Paper text:
Here, we show that an ankyrin repeat containing effector LegA15 localizes directly in host lipid droplets (LDs), leading to Golgi apparatus fragmentation of the host cells by hijacking the host vesicular transport factor p115.
To further understand the molecular mechanism of LegA15, we solved its crystal structure at a resolution of 2.59 Å. Isothermal titration calorimetry (ITC) experiment further confirmed that LegA15 bound both GTP and guanosine diphosphate (GDP) but not NAD+. The disassociation constants (Kd) for binding by GTP and GDP are 1.38 and 20.5 μM, respectively. We overexpressed two LegA15 fragments (amino acids 1 to 192 and 95 to 471) containing its ANK domain and C-terminal unknown domain, respectively, in HEK293T cells, and found that the ANK domain but not the C terminus was colocalized with the LDs. Together, these data suggested that LegA15 is directly associated with the host LDs through its ankyrin repeats.
Residue numbers in the entry: 19 to 424, 426 to 442, 444 to 451
């Protein structure tokens, strides 16, 4: 009980593996399952039975026995073989699901039964460690050197690279502080390059205002009740306002587009292209607000603290819908799904395309008045913002690959030239 925090930290470290070695482990054990030829594995049944066991809140010896039972029920020859191979429909391993749910007891039982911690599982752990549930479990605050965005996350979350560093850092999971800073700086930079774009000077005032009022450290907002009084106040005044929004282990997108200054009506733009959304729903949903005043300081505070306070995906969504008046959205911008990422850049960024669309509907006098010429205008504006990100990241990469010609080398070669044939690419001179 007093030894569990340190014990579990040690076990994550003992069970750490590199992605390829864990993939060999999975392959090895899938070959092993063909020798016994038993019931083929059924992952969806394993997780169904898994999520039911965890709610019983049983203790170790009990849990290991039921874990074995439901493993064998699901076509796995052992609990260890389930924990190593099973993934759910969102692509989570059981360890990674336990940690994302901030369920540290069940995560340690998984560790006691052979679950392995690959990079993903460790980068979900690290997001999970900055939360109240982690504090009540006995975990310390996170080391302060984990506060700079790793080069592998900086270039990978923007360009689309899905690699890993030599130190084991994934390119795919990020804290809300460094990634919100980077979305904010990347919008001010675009506004400053296009100073007649009246849309993006307002988008930049919203991002600058909310990055300053939220005051995120790692993934916890620091100025806790005030940030919501301050964001609600800017919405009641009729200004564009991004609301940082999250739940346990996952970042969404949320902003408010006013009809105009002093006006009390407008639009709520929600974005989720990852965990929590049913595929058909991937992208951005626009709700018409006729009484902004359901967007309360308490709603705003709950949004910004969802991950920290342990809020589930469904708890946050119920709130976003009641602040929109329990009405259905009036539009859905279908956007690409994103798995194995908390979507700290992806859901922020795609939300901007629904801002543009609200600023175009606003200036046209409503969504029912948009022409198809307006949609292509919106998509061109958006795609011009994104192409500005990609170019400035590539130019950042090439230049940096060269203030140091020895992870940066992988970052360029890997995915950007190996999963992106669609693109003026810059070389890697050898020294």
């Amino acid at each position: 009980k007093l030894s569990a925090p340190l014990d579990m930290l040690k076990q994550m470290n003992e069970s750490t593996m590199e992605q390829t070695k864990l993939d060999e482990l999975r392959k090895k054990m899938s070959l092993q399952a063909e020798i016994l030829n038993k019931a083929k594995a059924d992952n969806d049944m394993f997780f169904r039975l898994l999520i039911e066991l965890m709610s019983l809140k049983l203790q170790g010896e009990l849990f290991k026995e039921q874990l074995s039972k439901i493993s064998k029920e699901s076509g796995y020859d052992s609990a260890q073989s389930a924990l190593i191979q099973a993934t759910n429909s969102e692509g989570q391993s059981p360890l990674q699901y336990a940690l994302q749910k901030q369920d540290f007891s069940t995560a340690k039982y998984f560790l006691d039964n052979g679950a392995k911690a690959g990079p993903i599982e460790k980068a979900v752990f690290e997001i999970a460690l900055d939360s109240k549930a982690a504090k009540e479990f006995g975990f310390p605050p996170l080391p302060p050197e984990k506060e700079k965005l790793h080069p592998v996350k900086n270039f990978g979350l923007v360009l689309g690279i899905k690699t890993t560093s030599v130190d084991g850092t994934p390119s795919q999971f990020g804290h809300i502080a460094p990634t919100y800073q980077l979305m904010t700086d990347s919008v001010s930079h675009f506004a400053k390059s296009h100073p007649g774009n009246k849309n993006f000077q307002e988008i930049a005032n919203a991002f600058q205002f909310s990055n300053e009022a939220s005051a995120f450290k790692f993934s916890t907002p620091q100025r806790n009740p005030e940030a919501g009084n301050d964001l609600a106040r800017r919405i009641q005044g009729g200004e564009l306002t991004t609301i940082p929004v999250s739940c346990k282990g996952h970042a969404m997108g949320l902003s408010y587009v006013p009809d105009g200054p002093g006006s009390k009506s407008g639009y709520l733009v929600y974005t989720n292209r990852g965990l929590g959304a049913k595929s058909s729903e991937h992208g951005t949903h626009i709700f018409r607000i006729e009484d902004s005043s359901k967007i309360t300081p308490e709603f705003i505070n709950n949004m910004t603290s969802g991950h920290s306070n342990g809020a589930s995906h469904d708890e946050i969504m119920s709130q976003i819908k009641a602040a929109a008046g329990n009405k259905e959205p009036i539009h859905h911008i279908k956007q690409k799904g994103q798995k194995n990422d908390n979507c700290t850049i992806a859901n922020s960024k795609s939300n901007i395309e629904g801002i543009l669309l609200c600023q175009k509907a606003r200036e046209v006098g409503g969504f029912d008045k948009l022409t198809e010429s307006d949609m292509d205008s919106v998509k061109k504006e958006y795609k011009e913002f994104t192409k500005h990100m990609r170019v400035e990241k590539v130019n950042e990469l090439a230049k940096a690959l060269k203030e140091n010609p020895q992870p940066d080398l992988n970052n360029l070669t890997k995915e950007y030239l190996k999963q992106h044939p669609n693109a003026p690419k810059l070389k890697q001179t050898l020294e």
